[PDB]
Short mmCIF file of C-alpha atoms in Angstrom, two decimals:
data_model
loop_
_atom_site.label_atom_id
_atom_site.label_comp_id
_atom_site.label_asym_id
_atom_site.label_seq_id
_atom_site.Cartn_x
_atom_site.Cartn_y
_atom_site.Cartn_z
CA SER A 1 0.17 -0.26 -0.10
CA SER A 2 2.35 2.89 1.44
CA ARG A 3 6.27 2.62 0.08
CA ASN A 4 9.57 3.92 1.83
CA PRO A 5 12.64 2.74 -0.21
CA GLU A 6 15.31 4.90 0.10
CA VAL A 7 15.50 9.34 0.71
CA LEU A 8 19.30 10.40 -0.06
CA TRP A 9 19.35 13.86 1.80
CA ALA A 10 22.26 16.42 0.91
CA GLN A 11 22.78 20.10 1.52
CA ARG A 12 24.98 22.97 0.84
CA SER A 13 25.36 26.26 1.74
CA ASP A 14 22.35 27.66 1.07
CA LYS A 15 20.04 25.09 -0.24
CA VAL A 16 19.22 21.18 0.26
CA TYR A 17 18.79 17.82 -1.53
CA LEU A 18 16.08 15.67 -1.47
CA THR A 19 17.37 12.85 -3.63
CA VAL A 20 14.67 10.25 -3.25
CA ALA A 21 14.73 7.50 -5.18
CA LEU A 22 11.19 7.32 -7.74
CA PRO A 23 11.36 5.85 -11.23
CA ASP A 24 7.60 7.58 -12.34
CA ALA A 25 6.29 9.81 -10.73
CA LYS A 26 2.69 10.42 -10.13
CA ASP A 27 0.09 12.92 -8.09
CA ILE A 28 3.41 13.83 -5.59
CA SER A 29 1.89 16.85 -2.86
CA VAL A 30 4.03 17.89 -1.02
CA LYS A 31 3.27 19.46 2.94
CA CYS A 32 6.57 20.74 3.90
CA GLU A 33 7.12 22.97 7.35
CA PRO A 34 10.27 24.80 7.78
CA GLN A 35 10.29 22.89 10.78
CA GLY A 36 8.75 20.24 9.64
CA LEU A 37 5.73 18.28 7.39
CA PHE A 38 4.87 15.25 5.03
CA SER A 39 4.81 14.54 1.54
CA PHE A 40 2.83 12.21 -0.31
CA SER A 41 3.31 10.89 -3.42
CA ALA A 42 1.81 7.71 -6.29
CA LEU A 43 4.23 5.39 -7.36
CA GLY A 44 3.41 4.91 -11.16
CA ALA A 45 5.50 2.11 -11.84
CA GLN A 46 4.23 0.22 -9.48
CA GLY A 47 0.47 1.25 -8.50
CA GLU A 48 1.60 1.69 -4.67
CA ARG A 49 1.53 5.22 -3.17
CA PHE A 50 4.58 6.70 -1.51
CA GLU A 51 4.57 8.32 1.85
CA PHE A 52 7.42 9.83 4.09
CA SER A 53 7.55 12.16 6.72
CA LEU A 54 10.49 15.09 7.50
CA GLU A 55 11.41 16.98 10.72
CA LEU A 56 13.49 19.51 10.48
CA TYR A 57 15.87 20.69 13.81
CA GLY A 58 16.83 23.22 10.67
CA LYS A 59 14.73 25.51 9.48
CA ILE A 60 14.14 25.55 5.53
CA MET A 61 12.48 28.49 3.17
CA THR A 62 9.82 27.20 1.73
CA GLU A 63 9.82 29.40 -1.63
CA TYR A 64 12.95 28.09 -3.33
CA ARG A 65 11.93 24.32 -4.34
CA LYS A 66 12.96 22.25 -7.55
CA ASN A 67 11.88 19.07 -9.03
CA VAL A 68 14.30 17.70 -11.32
CA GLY A 69 13.63 13.71 -11.93
CA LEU A 70 15.60 11.53 -13.88
CA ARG A 71 15.44 8.27 -12.36
CA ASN A 72 14.54 9.72 -9.49
CA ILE A 73 13.17 12.73 -8.05
CA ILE A 74 15.68 15.26 -6.83
CA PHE A 75 14.06 18.05 -4.68
CA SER A 76 15.49 20.92 -3.40
CA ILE A 77 15.07 23.37 -1.44
CA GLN A 78 16.43 26.73 0.28
CA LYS A 79 16.97 26.33 3.96
CA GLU A 80 16.75 29.74 5.59
CA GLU A 81 20.27 30.59 6.90
CA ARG A 82 19.39 31.86 9.93
CA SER A 83 22.21 30.84 12.43
CA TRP A 84 22.94 27.18 13.38
CA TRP A 85 21.16 24.28 12.12
CA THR A 86 23.70 21.62 13.36
CA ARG A 87 21.22 18.56 12.50
CA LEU A 88 18.17 18.93 9.66
CA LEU A 89 16.48 15.74 11.68
CA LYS A 90 14.63 17.16 14.71
CA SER A 91 13.53 13.60 16.30
CA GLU A 92 18.12 12.81 15.75
CA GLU A 93 16.97 10.58 18.49
CA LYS A 94 15.38 8.29 16.18
CA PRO A 95 15.74 8.67 12.26
CA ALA A 96 13.57 7.19 9.82
CA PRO A 97 14.69 4.05 8.31
CA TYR A 98 14.05 5.07 4.55
CA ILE A 99 16.13 8.69 5.74
CA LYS A 100 20.15 7.60 3.58
CA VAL A 101 23.24 9.63 2.57
CA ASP A 102 23.77 11.19 -1.29
CA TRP A 103 26.72 10.50 -2.55
CA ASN A 104 26.44 12.77 -5.27
CA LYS A 105 25.30 15.68 -4.24
CA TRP A 106 27.59 16.32 -0.96
CA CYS A 107 29.38 19.82 -0.92
CA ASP A 108 32.83 18.61 -3.74
CA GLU A 109 35.89 19.54 -2.17
CA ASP A 110 37.37 19.99 -5.15
CA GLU A 111 36.41 16.90 -7.01
CA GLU A 112 35.81 16.98 -11.16
CA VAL A 113 32.80 15.47 -13.09
CA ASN A 114 34.07 16.45 -16.46
CA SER A 115 35.62 13.75 -16.79
CA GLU A 116 35.14 13.06 -20.96
CA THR A 117 31.48 12.60 -19.49
CA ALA A 118 30.74 15.61 -22.53
CA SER A 119 31.64 13.69 -25.24
CA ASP A 120 28.71 14.72 -28.25
CA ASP A 121 28.56 12.95 -32.26
CA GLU A 122 26.98 14.35 -35.05
CA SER A 123 25.79 13.17 -37.99
CA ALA A 124 26.99 16.05 -40.33
CA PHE A 125 27.63 15.74 -44.25
CA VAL A 126 30.66 16.61 -45.63
CA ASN A 127 30.98 15.47 -49.95
CA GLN A 128 27.74 14.34 -51.64
CA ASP A 129 29.45 13.04 -54.83
CA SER A 130 27.24 9.57 -55.99
CA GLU A 131 29.14 9.61 -59.03
CA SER A 132 28.56 6.78 -61.62
CA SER A 133 30.20 5.78 -64.68
CA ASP A 134 28.66 4.63 -68.07
CA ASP A 135 29.34 1.38 -70.90
CA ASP A 136 27.64 2.11 -74.21
CA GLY A 137 25.86 -1.48 -73.47
CA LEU A 138 27.43 -3.81 -77.25
CA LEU A 139 29.79 -3.75 -79.60
CA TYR A 140 29.51 -7.01 -80.15
CA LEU A 141 29.15 -8.32 -84.40
CA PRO A 142 28.70 -11.09 -85.38
CA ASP A 143 32.53 -11.15 -87.19
CA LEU A 144 32.29 -13.68 -90.82
CA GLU A 145 29.76 -14.37 -92.42
CA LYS A 146 29.62 -18.53 -90.55
CA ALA A 147 27.64 -20.29 -92.67
CA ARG A 148 27.05 -24.07 -93.37
CA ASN A 149 28.11 -25.80 -96.51
CA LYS A 150 27.50 -28.22 -97.85
#
């Protein structure tokens, strides 16, 4: 009925990233407070529901919100830089078992992600020739009067 796969978190100075393992997104209704709220999604690839709840120890700015999805739904929300948010989860005593860490949206301390990844090729046109030769057809002639004599 209700599903909760892995949900990866990662943060930057201003914004925070939410990496949800969700192939086919359907009817996503998001209730988030700067202090915590619950989000409801529907999984179209299974026919199942998705539902998680986030209690925020830190404080969020629900104004800046982006949902970008490849094979998964990445939801980036801007954190309100009020003072010091040591933890994202208000309930640090008991985290949700579906909460995990995103190893790719973490603050890259001098990494590099352009490692021969940007290789593009096109079907460019160059020379159109299609030159062909033509023959006369035939020059075969009966050489001699080859007849059967008696």
